[PDB]
Design a protein around this nucleic acid. Structure first.
Ligand SMILES: [Zn+2]
Lengths: 77, 91, 52, 96, 249
RNA sequence: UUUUUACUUAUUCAAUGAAGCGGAGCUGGAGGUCAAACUCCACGUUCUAGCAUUAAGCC
RNA sequence: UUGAUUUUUCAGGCCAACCAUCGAAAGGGAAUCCGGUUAAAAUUCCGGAACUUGGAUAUGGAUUCUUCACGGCAACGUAACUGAAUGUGGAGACGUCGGCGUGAGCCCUGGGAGGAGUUAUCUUUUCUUCUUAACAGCUUAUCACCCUGGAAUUGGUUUAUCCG
RNA sequence: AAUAGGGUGAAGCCAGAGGAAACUCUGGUGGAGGCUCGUAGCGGUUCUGACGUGCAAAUCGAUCGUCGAAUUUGGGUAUAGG
């Protein structure tokens, strides 16, 4: 499994022709220097690797989710 | 302090094998564990590997020597004998 | 080693993945100096091939 | 005799001890004489005298090793080669 | 009686030499055109320990005169030979320690080792540590050279036979006592199965001609004829004399 | 018939991936040259742990 | 081994030290892990996540008008970044003992969040859960090496005195 | 492939003390040895113990030897009846 850091690279990767499905995982975390925040992991399943993008911003996650290709099957966990 | 009066390196053998054999061992075993001056780099870093093999830690030169000394007296004589006979042939 | 890229198995220099830097340096200097003396021994020989 | 001349240069004149200092002094043209110990490796030796040929510097071949070359200079360490920058009260340059 | 321990060694079942750790056969180069007419130069790469041998071996790399290839030779290291030394072999090689020269090219008194009995056999005489061959004289009309072997024997060899200048390295090995049975065990662990030795006088009459008796004793003269047969040659075979050697021989 | 030593092809020993053998001739170094150039020797590698492979060149 | 030829013919170019074969379920050796599952199988099944070897093969990137890339004084760096015959090396690949150092697992222990036990008395108590695989990326080291500089009032330095 | 934990304390090294020199003494450090006490292991001394139609065609118990090497051991392999 490979982690993706660049959000722009992730959207270009999610529209690759071999991408079967996607996973949106929500983790209720806390930074211990504040209070609860909602982390989101976007996971793209390619032929060889699963690619994960960690989005700690609860608003950038929602914008990113609607920026994925509409054809991908998305599982919400 | 001085730990042993006379056995020295052969004190590892205890009381065994006979005193004459242990003092005969001591002479040649001090020589084989000594550090010798390197004729190549000038440092005193030459130690024995196996018999006849003497390596320098510094310059990594290996020279063929004696069983327990870097040079035997017989080899030193041959070195001068060969040197002398070489001069006459080459004038 | 068969399944890794070439940059992992070599160094960008002569004898890169085969010899160390100091041993390559000694080869270069030895090659230059010895070949320079080969010319000196040749011109000197030609000096003794015309007067003696 | 040259040992006495060399000892005087160390006492009164200028010098560098060591291979790296000698090569720098040949590059800068500050060397008047290069002294090489007998047990110096030939590759290092044949390179020092190539530097001296380019630099037009005389070379003196010491008869002892780097242990004996060091002690002539009044040093408690080994000197494989040295360069004379300024022969002072001595006359080593006129004899070599 | 029974087949005695002398005779069981020829079959060579458990009496072959232990040769796993040996570093190759020590030989001179094959006598070729370069050695017959000029000299060839090699460089000492290694000086190594050969298990079962007192003398260290030298690995010397030569160029092949006829094809692009390196040839590694296994020489017996003479004392004073060092790694990185240039070794010269041939008729025109100079008289320096480690060089391989024909016997006729060496003046009288030259100390030489790994000498050829016959031209091209690549070394037979004076190969053990501390040993050497002295050149006594030459007979140029017959192309022969007189040498003295480590045993004190005088031999006449062809002047084309080769030898290596110097003394075999590793000498003085015998000066130190072994002090232990374990030291002899380790000595023969990489040579062959010849240690330890049971005395034949301590066996039974089946095992040895010396076995048996109500005291341990040989019973008959232990000097055995040269014409005796296998199973009889136990003791001093063809002994010209016996007893403590007194005076010169 | 016996003794000795000459030959090499039988026979025997050894080596090599059967690489340079034997003779002669080119080139120098020499003999003192007493015809006329005969005889002898050599005939590309030695401060250095480099390199030498799949011919350049000329006709 | 190539250029092939479709002329199913070939043209050649290199080599020929050594090389039948058998011989290890403890030697050498390409590549997999976790969770779950059976009455009985599991590194084999299921779920997920990887890897190696062989083959085919396109796209992107890279490179070329100074044709077969740039940077760094250097040790060397990188996403790539021609290379036949032949050759040279390295890895495979190596005893034993001694103390020292680092890591991992285990042992010990504090706080907190749970569960169980003792509770005539005492015990903020006794026991227990609090875990993280192969694999991918970045970072991380003794040793070794490079540049600078030129050292006696010798200095650095290990438990073990070696280095300049 | 296997071999607890101790004792002793060889070379080498550091420091101090004494001496004109040749050299000597002391305190540490170090960790040698077919060394030593002693487990596992390997062996098999004595009880001339048990048993002796046995648990056993060689065992059981205590006692004992040795225990870092000439050590112990698996597998592969070789040696075949005068
Ligand atoms: Zn050295």
């Amino acid at each position: 499994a490979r982690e993706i850091k660049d959000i722009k690279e992730f959207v270009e990767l999610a529209r690759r022709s071999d991408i079967k499905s996607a996973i949106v995982k929500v983790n209720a975390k806390v930074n211990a220097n504040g209070k609860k925040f909602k982390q989101t992991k976007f996971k793209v399943r390619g032929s060889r690797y699963q690619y994960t993008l960690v989005v700690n911003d609860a608003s950038k996650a929602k914008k990113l989710q609607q920026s994925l290709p509409p054809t991908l099957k998305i599982t919400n966990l | 302090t001085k730990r042993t009066k006379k056995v020295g390196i052969t004190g590892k053998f205890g009381v065994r094998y006979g005193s004459s054999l242990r003092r005969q061992t001591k002479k040649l075993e001090v020589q084989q564990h000594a550090k010798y001056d390197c004729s190549f780099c000038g440092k005193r870093t030459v130690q024995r590997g196996a018999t006849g093999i003497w390596n320098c830690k510094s310059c990594k030169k290996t020279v063929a020597g004696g069983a327990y000394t870097v040079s035997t007296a017989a080899a030193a004589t041959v070195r001068s004998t060969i040197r002398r006979l070489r001069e006459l042939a080459e004038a | 080693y068969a399944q890794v890229s070439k940059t992992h198995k070599t160094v960008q220099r002569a004898y890169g993945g085969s010899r160390c830097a100091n041993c390559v340096k000694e080869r270069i200097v030895r090659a230059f100096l010895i070949e320079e003396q080969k010319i000196v021994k040749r011109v000197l020989k030609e000096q003794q091939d015309k007067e003696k | 005799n040259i040992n006495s001349k060399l000892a005087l240069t160390i006492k009164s004149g200028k010098y560098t001890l060591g291979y790296k200092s000698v090569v720098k002094s040949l590059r800068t043209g500050k060397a008047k004489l290069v002294i090489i110990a007998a047990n110096t490796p030939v590759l290092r030796k044949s390179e020092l005298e190539y530097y001296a040929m380019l630099s037009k510097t005389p070379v003196y071949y010491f008869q002892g090793g780097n242990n004996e070359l060091g002690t002539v200079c009044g040093k408690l360490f080994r000197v494989g080669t040295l360069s004379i920058l300024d022969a002072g009260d001595s006359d080593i340059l006129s004899s070599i | 009686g029974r087949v005695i321990r002398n005779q069981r060694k020829g079959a060579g079942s458990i009496f072959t030499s232990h040769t796993r750790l040996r570093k190759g056969a020590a030989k001179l180069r094959t006598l070729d055109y370069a050695e017959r007419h000029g000299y060839i130069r090699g460089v000492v790469k290694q000086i190594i320990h050969d298990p079962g041998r007192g003398a260290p071996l030298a690995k010397v790399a030569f160029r092949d005169p006829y094809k692009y290839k390196l040839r590694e030779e296994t020489f017996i290291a003479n004392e004073g030979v060092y790694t990185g030394q240039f070794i010269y072999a041939g008729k025109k090689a100079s008289l320096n320690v480690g060089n391989i020269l024909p016997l006729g090219a060496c003046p009288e008194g030259t100390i030489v080792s790994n000498v050829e009995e016959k031209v091209g056999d690549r070394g037979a005489l004076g190969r053990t540590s501390g040993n050497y061959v002295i050149i006594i004289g030459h007979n140029p009309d017959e192309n022969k050279t007189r040498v003295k072997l480590p045993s004190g024997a005088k031999k006449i060899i062809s002047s084309d036979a080769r030898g290596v200048i110097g003394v075999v390295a590793g000498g003085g090995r015998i000066d130190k006592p072994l002090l232990k049975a374990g030291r002899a065990f380790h000595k023969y662990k990489v040579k062959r199965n010849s240690w330890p030795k049971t005395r034949g006088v301590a066996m039974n009459p089946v095992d040895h001609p010396h076995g048996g008796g109500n005291h341990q004793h040989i019973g008959k003269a232990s000097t055995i004829s040269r014409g005796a047969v296998s199973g009889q040659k136990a003791g001093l075979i063809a002994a010209r004399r016996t007893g403590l050697l007194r005076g010169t021989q």
